[PDB]
């Protein structure tokens, strides 16, 4: 998972 940090963005449409 090279973009795992993105899993922490809870403030998007998805």
């Amino acid at each position, epitope marked *: 998972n090279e973009q*795992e*940090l*993105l*899993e*922490l*963005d*809870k*403030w*998007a*449409s998805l």
Partner: antibody
Amino acid sequence: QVQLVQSGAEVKKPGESLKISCKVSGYNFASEWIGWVRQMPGKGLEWMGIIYPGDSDTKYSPSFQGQVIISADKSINTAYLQWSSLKASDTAIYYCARQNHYGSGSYFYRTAYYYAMDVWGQGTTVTVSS
Amino acid sequence: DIQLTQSPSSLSASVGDRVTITCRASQSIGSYLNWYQQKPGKAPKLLIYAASTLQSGVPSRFSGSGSGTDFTLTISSLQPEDSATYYCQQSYSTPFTFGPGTKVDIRR
């Protein structure tokens, strides 16, 4: 003023279960990650894991996964850390800290924010002894 | 997980001295790095995030720099109240590991 108020220091025997809490005020508890950090006597900081109270999504360090559960009750602005069976090596100070997010990003896709622990509880001293 | 080292492990310097602590990561983490200060008897305090952004309430003499694998925390004019332990932390991917720490002592 954001404030994290942690539960009191405890002593518990080996094998016992324990749940400690951190009560939050001053911001929307459901809207930021919040986490737990261990500090063993005379040692450095160890990031244990975080939880997002909004949906209770959790991320653990693999060193702590399956050994502790982090949970949250957003109805009373409280985050918890639990053990099923304490070991003597669990003796430490446990801090609960808000893992705030920084930077600006689009609503229409996931953003790589800068996350940092900007407000910390006073710490809970946990002692495993008979 | 990502591994961080800090150098040195402890240092001493005089009041007014410029002092640098170095963090090094096992992979490039861009600017996704924080610095914290822990004074004895106290919870840690956030000093810097995004590698160089100073947090509100932190004195100007603290500065962070570096990008990718290597990072430095600089205290420009060491004051006695800076005697403490400093931790870097990567925020690139969970777990957000803390470095081992560097203790700063005042020489007087």
